[PDB]
Amino acid sequence: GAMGSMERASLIQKAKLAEQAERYEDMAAFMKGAVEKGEELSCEERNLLSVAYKNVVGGQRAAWRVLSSIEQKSNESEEKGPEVREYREKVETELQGVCDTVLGLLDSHLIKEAGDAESRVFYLKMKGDYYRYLAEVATGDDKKRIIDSARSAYQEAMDISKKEMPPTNPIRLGLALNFSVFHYEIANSPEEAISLAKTTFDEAMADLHTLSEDSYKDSTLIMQLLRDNLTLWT
């Protein structure tokens, strides 16, 4: 790797600079280099890793959706050649490459070394998320297996989070939010999505009384996203 000669602490420092400059591809490359040093990541470092790759894949997903919509309109009327499909495929392949990179970091060896609930749930949620992004573009004989891989990662994360974290924990809430999106948008299970969002919101509501002002703000921000989805879905 091109980051093999840079100090771990320097990679982290530069990832933070890249974030300030909105240079998310650089940020992701720095954080990949930091992961590959082989040490476990702190809470701050895990969040840097997620912010970096979420922004990279977010731009790719937005572009893929634009190109996929153009391609769909083209197949309704004048023939324009292979260019739309070719370019959609180019963006899709780069998206899949980023997802494979993230999944590879989780598999070598972030998940297997993560013993505390906060780290393990965070990484398993990420695994579900990046399989979900792969599922968004999957169309062939592997769509079912990709969907099953996302479901399995989310389910393992859910089981740990329910046993080890309070219902207001932001990681637990964000996991439940994303698993509900998986059910609605990927798994053709809107009723499961709605039930999960409702139960998650209500259990968090009942635990808010235990929280400080700052933790209350952290939890209610995610709870509002669950409510926004319920409003969209019902």
């Binding site: 912010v51 964000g174 999106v181 609605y184 933790s215 952290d218």
Partner: peptide, 10 residues
């Protein structure tokens, strides 16, 4: 499209 989680989670 539904909302998914922010990348930063406390």
């Amino acid at each position: 499209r539904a909302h998914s989680s922010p990348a930063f989670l406390q």
